Amino acid sequence: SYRKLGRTSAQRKAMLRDLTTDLIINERIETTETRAKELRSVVEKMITLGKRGDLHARRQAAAYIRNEVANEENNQDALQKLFSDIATRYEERQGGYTRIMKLGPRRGDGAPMAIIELV
Amino acid sequence: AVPFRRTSKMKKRLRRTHFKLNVPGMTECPSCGEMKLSHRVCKACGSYNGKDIN
Amino acid sequence: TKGILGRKIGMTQVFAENGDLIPVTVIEAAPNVVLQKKTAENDGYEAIQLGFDDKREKLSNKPEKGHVAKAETAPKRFVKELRGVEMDAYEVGQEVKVEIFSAGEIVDVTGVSKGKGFQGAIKRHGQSRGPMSHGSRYHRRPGSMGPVDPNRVFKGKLLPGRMGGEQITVQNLEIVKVDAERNLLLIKGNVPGAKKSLITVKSAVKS
């Protein structure tokens, strides 16, 4: 199955969207372990849509990828970055564009943390 | 719903036997070993399979 | 008596020669190898051990490999006994296949039901609810706990707890078809257990 992450069905979707949009821009994040484990699947699904490279694809991804500037001095939307750079970067791999690396706990509430990045 | 009698010291001490915590599962790093946690990247020099990430 | 063991695959249907539909369960079987023999003088009773579904070398220790040295086969995953058999016509290392069962025979099947976890009184024991209106404050909870005179609770009161996951036997089940090439059995009905479990298939002993 999947995990509910302690949110309602409508905030879970928004949080997943925000995380998958930030990962594209920053190339590496750090969140909890459960969030990373539930995020890698959606991010991998999005990458493949981009690799296809069509108008239907572009439009499907558009209805999920938040609209934030991904590169200054280039007026590059995050969608344009996804369909331009990453697709050529991983043009030969067959799946598995992510890796998760664990760290120590957190001081405030003892949560376990992890770093998720693109490979 | 209210205790009938007070609790002695023997019963209290007997009940507290399982209220304890264990040692962590930890091992040192090949490069500048600093006795980190197993399957985790250390924060000073326990360089996980390469560089020391943090 | 007679019997073998295998896994369980799923459920389906079969149209009989009278164009009648009957549910069906599938058993995997595969050849079974006898591993040991127990005698009245040496052990106190008569039985034979069975082996099934060998595993790779890394998953077995040294006593296990020593035990199957006599039967001259690879280590096996499942082993269990079967009492009441004719002690002859059986040697250590011999093979036993699905042909021992005929098309129309009757059989008992034993397994382990699926787990259900911590369940309540109404589901675990099939009790009744209280009314849900008319100023009632008693819906799904266990009943009274007995009289006042004994000053205690009897042994045998029924309360919530972990439910399922025990050993069950279902008797008087027919066989439909035997498929020797793939080592298959086609029972008629349902059988305790999840998918990919261990099922014992023994000949019927009346009831």
Next chain:
Amino acid sequence: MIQQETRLKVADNSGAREVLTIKVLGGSGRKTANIGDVIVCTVKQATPGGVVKKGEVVKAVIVRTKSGARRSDGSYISFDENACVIIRDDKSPRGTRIFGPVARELRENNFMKIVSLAPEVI
């Protein structure tokens, strides 16, 4: 499924128009009746000109039910109406004609004087 206090209209020319059930015969706690069964029931609404009137307790046989009837070969039948005919001791009916299709899961019992006078026995 038919229980106590279930409106259920007659499908023959006896005089009644609508009939409510009282008890399901057979058994010592039987709760529901499926098809091809007998029930004792009263008459709530009736035609002025006939042989049966209001308030009279009689016996009837179930003919149609919205719940289906399974068959050995695996096929099902189902309707959109609950209907019954009137009978008396011997399974011969009181009326002379039956209106509507009649389920054939009524054949196994001794209900021939019923099947005969009815179209579409299905």
Next chain:
Amino acid sequence: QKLIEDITKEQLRTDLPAFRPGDTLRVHVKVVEGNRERIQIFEGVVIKRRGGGISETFTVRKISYGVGVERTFPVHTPKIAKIEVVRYGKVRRAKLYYLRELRGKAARIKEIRR
């Protein structure tokens, strides 16, 4: 579930024509009344097509004498002589449950043909 496919491949039928949920047809079932065997004909509209293997089932609804009668069959039953298709139908869904309360000329589906 592959093993089930190899087990039951043989009993599948290779005769029936292809039809859709909105479609009028006519089935040829065999009735063994007593000792005699007579072929009865059912004619009506298709309502449902939920299946998936050796276990598909289609329902056909008709009306006779003012009472709506339904019959459900398995697709691969060996009590079926043959299946026809009389008319086609232009419909917009796969489960036509709205045809139950609706009656009169509010019924009747558009015919596609060619």
Next chain:
RNA sequence: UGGCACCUCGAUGUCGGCUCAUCGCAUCCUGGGGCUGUAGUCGGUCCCAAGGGUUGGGCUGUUCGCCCAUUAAAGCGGUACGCGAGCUGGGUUCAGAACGUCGUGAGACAGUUCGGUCCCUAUCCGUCGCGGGCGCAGGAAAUUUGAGAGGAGCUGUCCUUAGUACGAGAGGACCGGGAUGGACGCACCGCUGGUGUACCAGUUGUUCUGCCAAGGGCAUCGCUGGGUAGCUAUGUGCGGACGGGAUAAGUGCUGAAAGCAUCUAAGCAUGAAGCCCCCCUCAAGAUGAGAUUUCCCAUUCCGCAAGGAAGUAAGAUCCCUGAAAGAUGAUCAGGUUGAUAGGUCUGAGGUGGAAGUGUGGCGACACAUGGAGCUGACAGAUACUAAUCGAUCGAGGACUUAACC
């Protein structure tokens, strides 16, 4: 039911419903018998038997009772109304507000409408489930016997036997075979359904993506039509079968005391839904700690002495990937001589005919794609990503004694 008055405590809340029940037999049904004023069919009455079973509504009254329709039957009683830190004060229980009959009067009994707002986070013993220690006298991995305990235990019609036995007649069998039901229990999702908030499609208002087309947010998941896995019944499969041993009330065989007789005092039989086995489940903490098969070897230091330390072997655990398991522990499948999860391909299933581009359209729209662009829990391939390196524990057969050897 009275009489009488011993523990009245910050009280000796008394009766009907709900949820769960247990015990007696002085037997309502089912099993076995003796007498009849017992031709059969049906009865009456009296013994032996407590394993199982023993119902849905209307009437006002909470009670007692009267009725309607069924069934094999709708049994009497005890457990502080059996059960209010489990529900209903329902009516006991107040009273507080008002509405006839007796009071000079204050008021006292009316019969009726309204009210009580009522509380409790379980310490100990009891119950129901799940773990951690140590023991079983080398250390380990598996397979088991059964002292003992629990569960189950119910009944109706129809067809034969046979319109036969019996009986003027009407009527109508014992014993024995065969089908098919009701209530109850255990498993399961192939079928008929239910739900199915990260599946598909239509649509109202108002905002946002600079505009058109295409989309996102909010409005009970905005509303409506369908639905995969898993969980489920009202759905499907199966069960209470057949027999042994000793008996109860009974029926008896030979047989004396008592030349006869006599179920008995010697002795030997038959005889029940009771009893002990037969069927299903748990079971060696059964300190009486049981049995069989397979591995490891008898190292190194101190201590004359018993003994005490240190590395290990066979074997495990810590740690990590997960679910056929699960509150948490536990159980189970795997750790790079690997398919344990995710991804990527190829499928099964669900919804159903995408967008873009034509073409025909005044338009509102339709036709050419697709029976596929869309697809979360379901299969088969494939090391692309993650299960790295390491660390802790674990024996020298305790101890003799006799017989055997």
